[PDB]
Amino acid sequence: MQFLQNIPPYLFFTGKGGVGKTSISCATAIRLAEQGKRVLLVSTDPASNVGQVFSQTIGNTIQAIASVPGLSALEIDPQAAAQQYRARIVDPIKGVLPDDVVSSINEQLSGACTTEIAAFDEFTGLLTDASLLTRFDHIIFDTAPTGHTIRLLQLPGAWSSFIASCLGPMAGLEKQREQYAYAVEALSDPKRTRLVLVARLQKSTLQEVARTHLELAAIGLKNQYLVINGVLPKTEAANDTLAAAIWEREQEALANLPADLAGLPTDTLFLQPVNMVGVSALSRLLSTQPQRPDIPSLSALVDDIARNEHGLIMLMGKGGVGKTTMAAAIAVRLADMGFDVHLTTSDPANNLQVSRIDPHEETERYRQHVLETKGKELDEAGKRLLEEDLRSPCTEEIAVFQAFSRVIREAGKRFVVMDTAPTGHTLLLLDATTPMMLLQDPERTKVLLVTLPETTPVLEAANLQADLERAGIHPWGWIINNSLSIADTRSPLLRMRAQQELPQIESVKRQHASRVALVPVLASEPTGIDKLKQLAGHHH
Numbered sequence: 001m002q003f004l005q006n007i008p009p010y011l012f013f014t015g016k017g018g019v020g021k022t023s024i025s026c027a028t029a030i031r032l033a034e035q036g037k038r039v040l041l042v043s044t045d046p047a048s049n050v051g052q053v054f055s056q057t058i059g060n061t062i063q064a065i066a067s068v069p070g071l072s073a074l075e076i077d078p079q080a081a082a083q084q085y086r087a088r089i090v091d092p093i094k095g096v097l098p099d100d101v102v103s104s105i106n107e108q109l110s111g112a113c114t115t116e117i118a119a120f121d122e123f124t125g126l127l128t129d130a131s132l133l134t135r136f137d138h139i140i141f142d143t144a145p146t147g148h149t150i151r152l153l154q155l156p157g158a159w160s161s162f163i164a165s166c167l168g169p170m171a172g173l174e175k176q177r178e179q180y181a182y183a184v185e186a187l188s189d190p191k192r193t194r195l196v197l198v199a200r201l202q203k204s205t206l207q208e209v210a211r212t213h214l215e216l217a218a219i220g221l222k223n224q225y226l227v228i229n230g231v232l233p234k235t236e237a238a239n240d241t242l243a244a245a246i247w248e249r250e251q252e253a254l255a256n257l258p259a260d261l262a263g264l265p266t267d268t269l270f271l272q273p274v275n276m277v278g279v280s281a282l283s284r285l286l287s288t289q290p291q292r293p294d295i296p297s298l299s300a301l302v303d304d305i306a307r308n309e310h311g312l313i314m315l316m317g318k319g320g321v322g323k324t325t326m327a328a329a330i331a332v333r334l335a336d337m338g339f340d341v342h343l344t345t346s347d348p349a350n351n352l353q354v355s356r357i358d359p360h361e362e363t364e365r366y367r368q369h370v371l372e373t374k375g376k377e378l379d380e381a382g383k384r385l386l387e388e389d390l391r392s393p394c395t396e397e398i399a400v401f402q403a404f405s406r407v408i409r410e411a412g413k414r415f416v417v418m419d420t421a422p423t424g425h426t427l428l429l430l431d432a433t434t435p436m437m438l439l440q441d442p443e444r445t446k447v448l449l450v451t452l453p454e455t456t457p458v459l460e461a462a463n464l465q466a467d468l469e470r471a472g473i474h475p476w477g478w479i480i481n482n483s484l485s486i487a488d489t490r491s492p493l494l495r496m497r498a499q500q501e502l503p504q505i506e507s508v509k510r511q512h513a514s515r516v517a518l519v520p521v522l523a524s525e526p527t528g529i530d531k532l533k534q535l536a537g538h539h540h
């Protein structure tokens with residue numbers, strides 16, 4: 001693998017939940033420890049499972065991995081780090097400022113943004129500890145900071161400005177400005193840091209990764225490698241329509257990578273029949289050469305949704321899980337059964353009217369607004385700090401939700417279906433200053449969580465649900481999209497993967513959701529009403 005060659009001391013893997021960052025990191029560590037290198041594997045995930053893969057426990061203390069001489073591990077808990085970040089700022093004012101005030105300040109430090117800043121504080125400590133490179137040849141991280149977090153920390157305004165906002169976290173920066181600048185130099189130095197962009201052969205993901213590449217390079221991280229994971233080996237595309245349609249779909253994408261990633265050294269890793277749970281399994285991942293559950297169809301959820309003839313239906317979930325596709329499929333079925341439906345989308349690509357809002361224009365409107373509102377009196381460094389804060393992922397969600405709010409009032413006379421929604425955290429924040437009760441009322445609004453029959457994706461969906469719950473919003477149901485167990489295939493590899501889904505689909509059924517739907521992988525893309533209708537399955 002090109003990414004495995006002459007690696008600098010710091011190795012970072014970035015990419016969406018479940019693309020394979022941790023798996024690839026563990027396999028990389030083993031491989032390097034076996035070449036005689038001293039390796040430190042830094043587990044960064046919220047519910048770390050790294051200990052599991054090595055069949056041993058690991059904590060916030062460096063420990064050698066008994067089963068792999070040369071390798072040690074360290075777990076940095078992000079939820080714990082944000083918690084302490086929050087406590088450092090809030091504890092001094094408890095019993096001082098009135099309870100509602102403290103509670104408001106506390107909520108401002110409970111979003112994904114505070115968690116990212118806290119994670120960076122953790123990354124910074126490791127990146128600045130020169131002693132580490134005295135004991136280790138390489139330190140591998142299974143996540144990486146975002147361009148947004150890095151830009152925030154490099155802005156002069158962050159160290160001299162006082163102003164829905166996510167800058168509250170800044171107040172908690174543990175270290176001196178010099179250490180963060182140092183950490184940033186370490187990240188931008190190709191002789192010290194290598195960044196691996198992990199992706200899947202799917203047109204959508206590739207575009208997101210392309211964007212990530214441009215943001216990080218723009219900041220100075222130009223030592224980047226592209227690793228395409230889970231690729232279907234051609235062999236499997238023999239004697240099977242799905243495996244062939246899939247193999248065909250990835251191939252097109254593989255041969256038509258987005259221009260921005262074309263010049264990057266690219267390696268591909270084949271799809272494995274079993275979720276790697278040991279060293280042999282892990283190491284097999286770097287190789288250069290190669291029955292159903294009892295869950296209702298989407299039709300079923302839609303059937304129960306139709307019951308009251310109207311209402312607000314909101315599809316939520318992480319990026320790329322299928323919110324827009326599911327929302328489309330829901331609106332089509334409702335419309336097809338005589339109900340009045342109004343579908344709203346943020347993605348540019350009768351008795352059913354569709355509204356498309358342009359995220360960019362809404363964001364910019366909303367941005368212009370918060371700028372004249374909170375920007376006055378701020379010097380220029382302060383305005384740039386504020387502008388960068390308006391570059392958080394939540395800024396867009398707020399702006400788009402803002403726009404969808406125009407037609408959310410129609411949920412009273414018909415069905416309004418939205419393909420995206422803000423977080424519970426953001427909702428709470430917006431409600432501090434918006435139709436909160438509407439969203440909280442179980443009748444009027446039905447929140448659907450879209451996810452995948454995979455480990456990380458399920459955990460991420462569960463965390464999004466816990467957060468909505470804090471905001472008094474209970475998800476009405478869960479939709480497990482792209483399932484193989486529900487799809488028909490004779491491909492042994494595929495059926496093997498379908499089997500790997502069972503545990504995840506089970507944890508959703510008996511722990512996360514009351515109402516659950518299973519949607520099959522359709523191969524290609526459900527772009528036409530036909531395909532869209534095919535996802536639902538039949539009545540009764």
Ligand SMILES: Nc1ncnc2c1ncn2[C@@H]1O[C@H](COP(=O)(O)OP(=O)(O)O)[C@@H](O)[C@H]1O
Pocket residue numbers: 015016017018019020021022023024142229230231269270271272273274275276277285454455456
């Ligand atoms: N090429 C692959 N083939 C088959 N399974 C894979 C591959 N890469 C990862 N996985 C499996 O997928 C899950 C995806 O996870 P992980 O590597 O935890 O990614 P992330 O850290 O990006 O969430 C695990 O259950 C895992 O063992």
Ligand SMILES: Nc1ncnc2c1ncn2[C@@H]1O[C@H](COP(=O)(O)OP(=O)(O)O)[C@@H](O)[C@H]1O
Pocket residue numbers: 203204317318319320321322323324325326347419481482483519520521522523524525526527535
């Ligand atoms: N069941 C499915 N079968 C095949 N492709 C799917 C399925 N669900 C989603 N996709 C495809 O996946 C992408 C994932 O997207 P999208 O539904 O736009 O989700 P989101 O709105 O959550 O980002 C699009 O390329 C899409 O058409």
Ligand SMILES: [Cl-]
Pocket residue numbers: 110111112113114166394425
């Ligand atoms: Cl946030």
Ligand SMILES: [Cl-]
Pocket residue numbers: 108109110111112113114115166169
């Ligand atoms: Cl936050």
Ligand SMILES: [Cl-]
Pocket residue numbers: 113114116117149152166169392
């Ligand atoms: Cl932030």
Ligand SMILES: [Mg+2]
Pocket residue numbers: 021022023045142456
């Ligand atoms: Mg991980």
Ligand SMILES: [Mg+2]
Pocket residue numbers: 323324325347419
């Ligand atoms: Mg979408």
